[PDB]
Design a protein around this ligand. Structure first.
Ligand SMILES: [K+]
Ligand SMILES: [K+]
Ligand SMILES: [K+]
Ligand SMILES: [K+]
Ligand SMILES: [K+]
Ligand SMILES: [K+]
Ligand SMILES: [K+]
Ligand SMILES: [Mg+2]
Ligand SMILES: [Mg+2]
Ligand SMILES: [Mg+2]
Ligand SMILES: [Mg+2]
Ligand SMILES: [Mg+2]
Ligand SMILES: [Mg+2]
Ligand SMILES: [Mg+2]
Ligand SMILES: [Mg+2]
Ligand SMILES: [Mg+2]
Ligand SMILES: [Mg+2]
Ligand SMILES: [Mg+2]
Ligand SMILES: [Mg+2]
Ligand SMILES: [Mg+2]
Ligand SMILES: [Mg+2]
Ligand SMILES: [Mg+2]
Ligand SMILES: [Mg+2]
Ligand SMILES: [Mg+2]
Ligand SMILES: [Mg+2]
Ligand SMILES: [Mg+2]
Ligand SMILES: [Mg+2]
Ligand SMILES: [Mg+2]
Ligand SMILES: [Mg+2]
Ligand SMILES: [Mg+2]
Ligand SMILES: [Mg+2]
Ligand SMILES: [Mg+2]
Ligand SMILES: [Mg+2]
Ligand SMILES: [Mg+2]
Ligand SMILES: [Mg+2]
Ligand SMILES: [Mg+2]
Ligand SMILES: [Mg+2]
Ligand SMILES: [Mg+2]
Ligand SMILES: [Mg+2]
Ligand SMILES: [Mg+2]
Ligand SMILES: [Mg+2]
Ligand SMILES: [Mg+2]
Ligand SMILES: [Mg+2]
Ligand SMILES: [Mg+2]
Ligand SMILES: [Mg+2]
Ligand SMILES: [Mg+2]
Ligand SMILES: [Mg+2]
Ligand SMILES: [Mg+2]
Ligand SMILES: [Mg+2]
Ligand SMILES: [Mg+2]
Ligand SMILES: [Mg+2]
Ligand SMILES: [Mg+2]
Ligand SMILES: [Mg+2]
Ligand SMILES: [Mg+2]
Ligand SMILES: [Mg+2]
Ligand SMILES: [Mg+2]
Ligand SMILES: [Mg+2]
Ligand SMILES: [Mg+2]
Ligand SMILES: [Mg+2]
Ligand SMILES: [Mg+2]
Ligand SMILES: [Mg+2]
Ligand SMILES: [Mg+2]
Ligand SMILES: [Mg+2]
Ligand SMILES: [Mg+2]
Ligand SMILES: [Mg+2]
Ligand SMILES: [Mg+2]
Ligand SMILES: [Mg+2]
Ligand SMILES: [Mg+2]
Ligand SMILES: [Mg+2]
Ligand SMILES: [Mg+2]
Ligand SMILES: [Mg+2]
Ligand SMILES: [Mg+2]
Ligand SMILES: [Mg+2]
Lengths: 134, 147, 206
RNA sequence: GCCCCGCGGACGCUACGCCGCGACGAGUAGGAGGGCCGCUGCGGUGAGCCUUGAAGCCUAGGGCGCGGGCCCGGGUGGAGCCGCCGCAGGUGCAGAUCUUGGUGGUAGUAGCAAAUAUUCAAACGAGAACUUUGAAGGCCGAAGUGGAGAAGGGUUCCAU
RNA sequence: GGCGAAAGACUAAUCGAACCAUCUAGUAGCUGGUUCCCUCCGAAGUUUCCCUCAGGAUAGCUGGCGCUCUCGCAGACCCG
RNA sequence: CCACCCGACCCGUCUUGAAACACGGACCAAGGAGUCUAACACGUGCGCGAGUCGGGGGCUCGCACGAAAGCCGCCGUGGCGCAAUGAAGGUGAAGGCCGGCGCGCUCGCCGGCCGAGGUGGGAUCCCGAGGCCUCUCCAGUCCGCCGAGGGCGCACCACCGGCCCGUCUCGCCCGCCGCGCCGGGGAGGUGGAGCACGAGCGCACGUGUUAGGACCCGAAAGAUGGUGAACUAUGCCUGGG
RNA sequence: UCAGUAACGGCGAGUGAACAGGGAAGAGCCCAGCGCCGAAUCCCCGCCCCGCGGCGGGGCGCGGGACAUGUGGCGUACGGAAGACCCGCUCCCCGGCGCCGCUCGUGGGGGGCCCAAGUCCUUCUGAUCGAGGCCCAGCCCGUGGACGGUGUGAGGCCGGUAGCGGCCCCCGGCGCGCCGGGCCCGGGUCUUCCCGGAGUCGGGUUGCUUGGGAAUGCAGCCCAAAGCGGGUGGUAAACUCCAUCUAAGGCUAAAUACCGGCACGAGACCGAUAGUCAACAAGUACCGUAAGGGAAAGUUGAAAAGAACUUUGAAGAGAGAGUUCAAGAGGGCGUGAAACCGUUAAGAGGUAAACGGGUGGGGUCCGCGCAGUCCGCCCGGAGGAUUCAACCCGGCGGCGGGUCCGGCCGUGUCGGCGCGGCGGAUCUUUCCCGCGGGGGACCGUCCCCCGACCGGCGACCGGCCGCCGCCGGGCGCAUUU
């Protein structure tokens, strides 16, 4: 149960904050689980999805083992486009189909200075909580 | 509880218990106590004799604290002390009587309703009724005045 | 319109009362707010008593309440003078001072004078400079005994003197309480007209 | 001796339940009782129902109840819903020249009749009584159906 | 209030007192309406008083809730 | 769905009287009218009971629920109830027998006992001669029902008496720090929303009554403050005909 | 709370305070005057030194001005001042030290970034967050099973949630630490001196106001003070006593109010004719000269995959095809009612239609009826067997035995236990001290314990015995079951 008096449980409020969140908040909302090997390697459960990240679709009609690259993170629509996750329009044009980032698993991360800083923050905190649970 | 009211049973009866002829109009007869000396005279004379007129002397700035004088009768006078005090006195070898201070109990005047148990008692009060003092004397007690 | 037997009622609802209706939905919130302020004040003023400065015993006025005592606003200047406390010093050490009150009787004055002295013994006075103490309570006394006294300081209680049973004398049995009240009322009622008549005959005879 | 060839002998009695007998039954205004009548939400409860199809809606389907109403089948629908014990109310419509929204008969009806008047040919065009061009016959008739302004309009001006 | 060679005319389709908002959900003994079912009981238009006569108060007529009592037996069966 | 026989006028409403040549209603959907607050009365349910009630405050390291709940008791202050009556000063609810006397009022002082009088009715309860009977007789025991008759009489009713307060008539006696224009007492009437071994308080529900928008819709009006002379009325200025 | 009270009122309708009491909070003070101090006071300007976004501190200036028509220190009704004598002393405050003490109360405040655990197996589906499973109480986390999102319905997919959880940054009060500094006597007794607000109070009269009633408050006009005075003392007035305060100058936190505003939480509320007028480009469109008035209006789908291409038409619009679980979702597109209409099928039709009762005919559909009682016992034939009674061995249960045994319980008497606890309008010169609280005795009650003794064991309860019943096993091996 939630105990913070300054945090709301209101359905209308939480929906309003979610659907009107600014982009930088939408980045956190668009987090995706790491793969087991990545989770074991970095001791991190989830990362905000980024373009040029290899993912697997694990739910929906496009679920499978294929590793695809994230080609576009459309935050305004809360959806991501993956390189082979497409479909055929009537006139023959091929369009990507949006997949919610919570329904994909990151298999390879696009590591740069910022991601490495983010990863070592989450793992330091996860480990510090173990120094709590113990 | 609205589900238990007559309103629920009156749904579909047209005049809602108020009549087809006389109806339920706004204020037939006036508002409040209108017509007490006129069209409503009989009611006022029958259930409220004395309603109209002036009687007596009026007193400005009445302070009810001044006339404060609670009373205790004789029959309930022994309740002011513990039952131990009453019995110990009745079986007391010498004629020692307990002292009952009705002012301590929150009473100022001792009235004389009822009868007392036959044992001496020293009653302290601001005021005593005549019969109250007589009955205290009859059982062998004494009346002591305090201020 | 009256109907059969009823009480004549005059409800005071002829103004725009609906515009001035005070609801009490913030009563739980008000109680919480007062509690937190009390706790905040107590922490700030520790170890001084939470309720506040000591108050004197006063007798409630009027015949309805003169049998009871209660806490007064502050100790009178005469009470402080007898107790040997400067009126300016009294406030700093936690003694309420009421310059308006005057002591009509010596019983009330001695009751509060004794209350002040007994308070002064119970008081633990910390030095203004912790390193240097001059006339303050002992370091040992301050170190352990000092704690915040919750509740009114030396609550004022109505004391009742027990009166043991005794043998009724002949005089008490012969005392006419009713007649004493009846004559005393008449003596007070007729005192003046008796002074007038008794005086009036004086120059009549002289 | 009580029991015994036999070891046994229906139902009942939610006591707020069950059973028997007798007499009774009109009703406006109005009163009262009962409602396992109905609506919405709350506390409990149904190890309740539900994407293997909830609510809603439709039904020459099958039934129950004096009735208020209810249950089920089929169809449609696509995500929620209901029973029971209590609680609560903005709780039940045929009317109010009621409110708002929608829709008929009237009815393809009344009407498209104030100020004389149009016709021929061609063009463009899918399409011409009505557009354009030419020809004819007419009207305004300088107090104009002409040519320009003020106020007001505000782009209506011009081209495509 | 204006203005009126005067008609109570005119004062923005409004005039024997404009228009707008508020007071204001103004008051109405007067008109209209007043939403499910079954069951049981079931009227009054009369008395008196009222600036009362299209209204009330009053008694009557109504319902509801009771309560205080009376009246039982020859009998599991039948049988005074 | 249709046929036939019998019955069968359109509802709502006001009304003595509606199918009316009384009014409203073309049709359908959705909305649509006794509410809530305070007060009061009675009735019913619950708790406690001569009491009852924290509603305001405070305490519990406030806070999902919890703005709840629990607790206070030298927090019951206070409300209502336990005492009435009078305009008020004020006064303020217990008597009956047994004696010992006095006095002759029909009363008064003392000791006792008892303890809210008496009469008629009175649910219930108690006693109960007499009865009923077993295979029979002799007397017994357990042991129910019927029971004339009698007794104690709840609540309640009616009546008599009594008690408190107001008021009146009457008449004597007593008290003492106040000898007084002092105080108290009796008896017979009469006024009181009194007494006569309490019944209330808190909470809830219902019905009725009222003040409130007060079941819903409805005036003609009244008031306060503002906006208008682009119409029109009239004066003036400056132009045109 | 007093209290719908005292009081007001065509004493009608109606109206209506205060004091005492209990609480929340609590905090006190400053002038003028009267005096004394050599104006001891203030503002401005210029310069320098130091803290130093102008906040200032000091120093200087034969700089200016205010001000004796009165600034400042002291002092104000609780009295004050001076002098003498006695007693006790070296304080207080503001700004920069540093280190950082610090629930400051739910962990000072503000901002940022992070922190548990299934997308396991099988299956359902368009998609799933559904269903089943995940040994041994174990799928896993849980101080986290609030909420929201994600193609259903998710504690474990994601954000979050919990946590005196972490990290970073900023801001503030306190706590001790040199200073830049300022500032610095008090109390008691005695003697003497000093001591107060005026066109104000008060009075008349008028009007309003109030519960204030022969005038509660306010104001106008007229009159107009006093100093042992003045005000008040709820009935006008005179006399007298008493009580009580000290007007006509000023400041002051808290408890209190808050339909505007800035943030935030919640709800037995409403759910698009409801709820704000406004869920939407709403005070918008539109109306009025203007003041002002003022709407209607939400929903494809999981995803636009928003229907390529062929074909008729001038096109609107169709017919094929295609997407989708679905277009029987096609762009005001969820569902799609009624009124009303079109078409199809059936029936009927000259007393407008419609209606009640009764039957008949037809139709629709249902029973799906269309060979249609089963159950119990007994008899006969024809089979099969884990075979019946009885008896033995275990286990369990029911009932009985309190003159079977523990345990216990109900109540009572006596002695006695823990100085036992609690209460008491009982007593206390046993006793203690500062004139009352203690501590004792007694009484009542409860609780414990301790011997005798006590009625009874659905109050709870075991062992034992007796009986009966059931179950499992054994024997029983066939006129039995
Ligand atoms: K009625
Ligand atoms: K123009
Ligand atoms: K009518
Ligand atoms: K009609
Ligand atoms: K009402
Ligand atoms: K005046
Ligand atoms: K049709
Ligand atoms: Mg909401
Ligand atoms: Mg009726
Ligand atoms: Mg009617
Ligand atoms: Mg009527
Ligand atoms: Mg306080
Ligand atoms: Mg009937
Ligand atoms: Mg059926
Ligand atoms: Mg509601
Ligand atoms: Mg309604
Ligand atoms: Mg309708
Ligand atoms: Mg109707
Ligand atoms: Mg025509
Ligand atoms: Mg025509
Ligand atoms: Mg012409
Ligand atoms: Mg011409
Ligand atoms: Mg001409
Ligand atoms: Mg004219
Ligand atoms: Mg005329
Ligand atoms: Mg106008
Ligand atoms: Mg109305
Ligand atoms: Mg009338
Ligand atoms: Mg009259
Ligand atoms: Mg008439
Ligand atoms: Mg009429
Ligand atoms: Mg007529
Ligand atoms: Mg009719
Ligand atoms: Mg006719
Ligand atoms: Mg009419
Ligand atoms: Mg009509
Ligand atoms: Mg409706
Ligand atoms: Mg009651
Ligand atoms: Mg209580
Ligand atoms: Mg809450
Ligand atoms: Mg509470
Ligand atoms: Mg009380
Ligand atoms: Mg009291
Ligand atoms: Mg009797
Ligand atoms: Mg006399
Ligand atoms: Mg009398
Ligand atoms: Mg009534
Ligand atoms: Mg109106
Ligand atoms: Mg008028
Ligand atoms: Mg003009
Ligand atoms: Mg009262
Ligand atoms: Mg007056
Ligand atoms: Mg008033
Ligand atoms: Mg007070
Ligand atoms: Mg001066
Ligand atoms: Mg997580
Ligand atoms: Mg979800
Ligand atoms: Mg979830
Ligand atoms: Mg799970
Ligand atoms: Mg947290
Ligand atoms: Mg005086
Ligand atoms: Mg006087
Ligand atoms: Mg000041
Ligand atoms: Mg809708
Ligand atoms: Mg709306
Ligand atoms: Mg609207
Ligand atoms: Mg579908
Ligand atoms: Mg398709
Ligand atoms: Mg469809
Ligand atoms: Mg659809
Ligand atoms: Mg649709
Ligand atoms: Mg028929
Ligand atoms: Mg039991």
């Amino acid at each position: 149960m939630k105990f913070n008096p300054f945090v709301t449980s209101d359905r209308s409020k939480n929906r309003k904050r979610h659907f009107n969140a600014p982009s930088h908040i939408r980045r956190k909302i668009m987090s995706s689980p790491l793969s087991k090997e990545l989770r074991q390697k970095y001791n991190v459960r989830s990362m905000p999805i980024r373009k040029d990240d290899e993912v697997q679709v694990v739910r929906g009609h496009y679920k499978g083992q294929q590793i695809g690259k994230v080609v576009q993170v459309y935050r305004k629509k809360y959806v991501i486009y993956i390189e082979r996750v497409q479909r055929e329009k009537a006139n023959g044009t091929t369009v990507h189909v949006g997949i919610h980032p919570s329904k994909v698993v990151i298999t390879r991360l696009k590591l740069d200075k910022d991601r490495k800083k983010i990863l070592e923050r989450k793992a330091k905190s996860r480990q510090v909580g173990k120094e709590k649970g113990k | 509880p609205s589900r238990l009211r007559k309103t629920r049973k009156l749904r579909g009866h047209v005049s809602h218990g108020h009549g087809r002829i006389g109806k339920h109009r706004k204020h037939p007869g006036g508002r409040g106590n209108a017509g007490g000396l006129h069209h409503h005279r009989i009611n006022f004379d029958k259930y409220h004799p004395g309603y109209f007129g002036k009687v007596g002397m009026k007193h400005y700035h009445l302070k009810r604290n001044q006339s404060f004088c609670p009373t205790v009768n004789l029959d309930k006078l022994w309740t002011l002390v513990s039952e131990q005090t009453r019995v110990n006195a009745a079986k007391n070898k010498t004629g020692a009587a307990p002292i009952i201070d009705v002012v301590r109990s929150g009473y100022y005047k001792v009235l004389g309703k009822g009868k007392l148990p036959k044992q001496p008692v020293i009653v302290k009060a601001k005021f005593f009724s005549r019969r109250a003092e007589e009955k205290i004397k009859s059982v062998g007690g004494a009346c002591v005045l305090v201020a | 319109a009256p109907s059969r037997n009823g009480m004549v009622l005059k409800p005071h609802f002829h103004k725009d009362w609906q515009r001035r209706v005070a609801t009490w939905f913030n009563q739980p919130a008000r109680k919480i707010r007062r509690r937190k302020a009390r706790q905040a004040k107590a922490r700030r003023i520790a170890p001084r008593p939470a309720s506040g400065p000591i108050r004197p015993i006063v007798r409630c006025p009027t015949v309805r309440y003169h049998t009871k005592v209660r806490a007064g606003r502050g100790f009178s200047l005469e009470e402080l003078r007898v107790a040997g406390i400067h009126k300016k010093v009294a406030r700093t050490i936690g003694i309420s001072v009421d310059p308006r009150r005057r002591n009509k009787s010596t019983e009330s004055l001695q009751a509060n004078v004794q209350r002040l002295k007994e308070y002064r013994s119970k008081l633990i006075l910390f030095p203004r400079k912790p390193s240097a103490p001059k006339k303050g309570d002992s370091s040992a006394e301050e170190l352990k005994l000092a704690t915040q006294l919750t509740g009114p300081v030396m609550p004022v209680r109505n004391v009742y003197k027990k009166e043991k049973a005794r043998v009724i004398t002949e005089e008490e049995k012969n005392f006419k309480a009713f007649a004493s009240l009846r004559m005393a009322r008449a003596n007070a009622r007729l005192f003046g007209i008796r002074a007038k008549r008794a005086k009036e005959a004086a120059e009549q005879d002289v």
